[PDB]
Amino acid sequence: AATLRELRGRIRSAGSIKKITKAQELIATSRIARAQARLESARPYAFEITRMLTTLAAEAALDHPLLVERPEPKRAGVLVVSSDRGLCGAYNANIFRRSEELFSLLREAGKQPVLYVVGRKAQNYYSFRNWNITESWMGFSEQPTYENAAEIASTLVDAFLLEGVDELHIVYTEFKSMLSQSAEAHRIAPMVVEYVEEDIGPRTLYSFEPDATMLFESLLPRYLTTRVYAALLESAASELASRQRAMKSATDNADDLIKALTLMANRERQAQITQEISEIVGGANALA
Template structure:
């Protein structure tokens, strides 16, 4: 009985050690990807900040709401660009952003543009309308892909097929902190800046502000999408690294506990054998 028990424990130790090797490897891969993802976020942020400032100034100049991108309209249908991961084992990363997106869509006629395999799987199972699954891999999405999505969405917006565009993603705060967030890409709404900024200092656009917006807005929306993708990818790697580090620590603790149980079981087996030998010798006497 004791021998069988020690064999089971040894088998369990080997199993946990194998799992620990996998989690350690995944932690190292996630750490490597996280470094590159952080560099991409830091490189992209200044461009998108400048783009945001340009769009704000253009919206302030269009006080008569002559542009379709600035004009207010009744929201009958909303397009949600939802960004999550392509795979699991990243703690609560996917679950948190998908739950957040579902809450935003509640009570709305929502059209979903999924970026990330988990998004397509999640919303297709729940009966949401998916416009396209062409860009379902978040890791392989580049700037030109973001611009393609933006061109498609802005064309639908101008045609009146959708009335607002929102981007749901995970904001990268630090390696330990990632928070779900959303951006309202269209219609352009800079109400605070419109009240704070003086009307006397306005920019002149040639040939006209409306034509400039028609060219710049798709790039602006594409920039927002790409920026959100970089933030989300860095968040995913940070969450996966944290999850795999915790899993490795738990596996190490389990191995220590199992080694202690193994030593106790082996000591008990040795004690039992000695007792049986002594008992047998006493019986022969």
């Protein structure tokens, strides 16, 4: 006795869990659709500012601080982009693995990692390891706005230009093909000047007001912010896809657990009936 009671209790518990996880998976699907919409909505401004930055760099003085690498690199400010909620799968764990790979790459080159985090999961992971988190941002992992990205990018570029960092990295989950949520490390500062080709031959001359260098130095931090915002959106879509996959997994697991628990409960029910009959017939045969 009292074993069938606990078995039925565990069965109804697992049923509640199964319902909740199935609902969470469908909600995550709808919100994946929303996040992909936001990503493909932010795409055009990114393309156009990239093209304008290229046009400006074509005729500018490429000696901006964000554009030249520094001898004596002592510190790289790393921005880790994690989630706030936790019903995702190995999303945060993959981000932390990639960030540890980046930290052990940065210690190989003599640089000291300066750590900025986005999300509460990274806060937990790094406070447990006695890390020093220069700044933390929370509450906008599932729907980030451009103002959050602007604040983050301004803080990071202020730390870069200055108690000062020589590089700037971002560890976030890239979202591709609705099937590839891959943790990646990018270097956002200093940028590297890459020459593709003259491409078009003799063409019209572009006018710059007031001149190319002013506009270039005005667009560089704007480009940093655009890239930070694109990273935030990709990480949000990746977190939602991971949450959908993890909730489908948890629903299947709760299904299998309900099945096994019901098998055990039916075994205990049959055993209880058999044992009760054995006792009744034992008494009746003792009296006969």
